[PDB]
Amino acid sequence: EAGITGTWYAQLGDTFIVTAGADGALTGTYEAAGAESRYVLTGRYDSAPATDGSGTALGWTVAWKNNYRNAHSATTWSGQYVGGAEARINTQWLLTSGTTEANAWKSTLVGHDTFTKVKP
Amino acid sequence: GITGTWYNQLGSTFIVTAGADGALTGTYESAVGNAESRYVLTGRYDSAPATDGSGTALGWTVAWKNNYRNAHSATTWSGQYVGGAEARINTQWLLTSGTTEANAWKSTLVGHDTFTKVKPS
Amino acid sequence: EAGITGTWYAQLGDTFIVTAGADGALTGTYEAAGAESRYVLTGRYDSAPATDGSGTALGWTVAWKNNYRNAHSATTWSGQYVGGAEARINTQWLLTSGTTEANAWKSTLVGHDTFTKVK
Amino acid sequence: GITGTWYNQLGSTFIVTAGADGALTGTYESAVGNAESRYVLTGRYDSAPATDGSGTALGWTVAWKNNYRNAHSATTWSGQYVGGAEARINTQWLLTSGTTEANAWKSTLVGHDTFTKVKP
């Protein structure tokens, strides 16, 4: 409380580090599976979650530009943090690429990822 | 182009600032849902978009807690800014509520919002 | 009287023709924007909708294979029918392409489309 | 390999037949939600998939009305069949409820279900 701050691991090797601020801020760095693969992460979480067995709602964005590379796209992850011995962040995500109007219908991928505090 | 006050199709107000760096900051006031007054938002955008007529990718998050209410929820919007005569931000969103594990299957709503610098209707 | 049977037009050129069966069946053809561009459509709808002003829930699928082409992908539309002078079907959709596991993370596009009875 | 009885991670039962012409037919019984007993499903699949190691694209719909209950809603699953050691159907789904116009923004739930021929 909160157990969100720290390092989180996805199934296929992505890793992020985040600080959950007392004001509801999420800030950190996302590393897609060196610094060439590291991107700024910024989001928000419920800083006063229920203590009734529910998850803690959250979301964040990564725009896939850094000093080295730029995919002209951005992912947002929406989900909840589930605490305990096997804590997890369960998310669904949208990845939108910049497109022309003609190609806008195929601008956005949807998917899901779970993150854990230990490597899977 | 992104910095300014935007309105979605339902009348919600999105006041955003785009930093030189890729940062989005601002406030969101929803016209619908378990929400009242302004909420903080943060996000990111592509600060060096392509020069081929493509839009500018972006996204942001609102956690639906402020000094007055808490819905134990958060929405993320993912989309692109399209400049021109009439600038638009076209998005799809995910709204996740805290749930127990048994109810996690019904935790997340999906939708689509289009933002313009004029109020709707 | 479901009001669904007939021809529907998407905002960007696509057309479909559907029959709403008394039992909840949707059956028809989707033409993408031309038999080369026509595909089988099948789905289901709520044949006894609420009478409180709510729309009529429905969904359908098109696999993008016909006798001429195969994109190795399928779209599902999930939405609701709203009747009246300006009847419409408001949908959100998921398009999944067959991929290897390594590429599964980019298998599925999401979007939305509204269909009307006039172009 | 699609024809058969499948279960998702919640214990829902998906009984499906794949027709030579690309048709999917069968029944769905949900372990969760406003649902009782079997519901009719129909859908489509790619009857001539790639041979390059890709999965087989498919989708289906259930309207949540049967002779017992009506939830005024429909779910569509969009995904792919992955033949493997243990065969799997990986999906994402959209559940839309009939709503008034004022509530249309909250009409649609999204999630992801994985189906195997084994029940959890």
Author numbering:
A (entry chain A): 14 to 46, 49 to 135
B (entry chain B): 16 to 136
C (entry chain C): 14 to 46, 49 to 134
D (entry chain D): 16 to 135
Which text from the study accompanies this structure?
The femtomolar affinity of streptavidin/avidin for biotinylated targets, combined with resilience to harsh conditions and an on-rate of ~ 107 M− 1 s− 1, is the basis for biotin's central role as a specific biological “glue” in diverse research methods and biotechnologies. We previously generated streptavidin heterotetramers with exactly one, two, or three functional biotin-binding sites, through purifying tetramers containing defined numbers of non-biotin-binding “Dead” and His6-tagged wild-type subunits. However, tetramers with two functional and two Dead subunits can assemble in three different arrangements. To generate a controlled and stable bridge for bionanotechnology, we demonstrate here a method for the simple isolation of streptavidin variants with precise cis-divalent or 1,3 trans-divalent arrangements.
In the 1,2 arrangement the biotin-binding sites of streptavidin are in a cis configuration as the binding sites both point in the same direction. To isolate cis-divalent streptavidin (1,2 arrangement of biotin-binding subunits), we introduced a series of aspartates into the loop between β-strands 3 and 4 (L3,4) of the Dead subunit. Introduction of the charges in this position means that in the 1,3 and 1,4 arrangements, these charged regions should be far apart, while in the 1,2 arrangement, the charged loops should be apposed. Since L3,4 is important for biotin binding affinity, it was necessary to insert these residues on the Dead subunit, so that the cis-divalent streptavidin could maintain high biotin binding affinity. Overall, the introduction of a series of negative charges into the surface-exposed 3,4-loop of streptavidin allowed the isolation of a second divalent species, cis-divalent. However, one condition obtained using the Morpheus crystal screen yielded the desired asymmetric unit for the cis-divalent streptavidin containing all four subunits. The obtained 1,3 trans-divalent crystal structure was solved at 1.6 Å resolution, and cis-divalent streptavidin was solved at 1.4 Å resolution, with the phases in each case solved using molecular replacement. For the putative cis-divalent sample, the electron density closely fits if chains a/c are Dd and chains b/d are SA, also confirming that the biotin-binding subunits indeed had a cis orientation. Furthermore, while the electron density around L3,4 could be clearly observed in the SA chains b and d of the cis-divalent form, the electron density of L3/4 was poorly defined in Dd chains a and c. The engineered L3,4 of Dd (chains a/c) is expected to be highly flexible, which would lead to weak diffraction in this region.
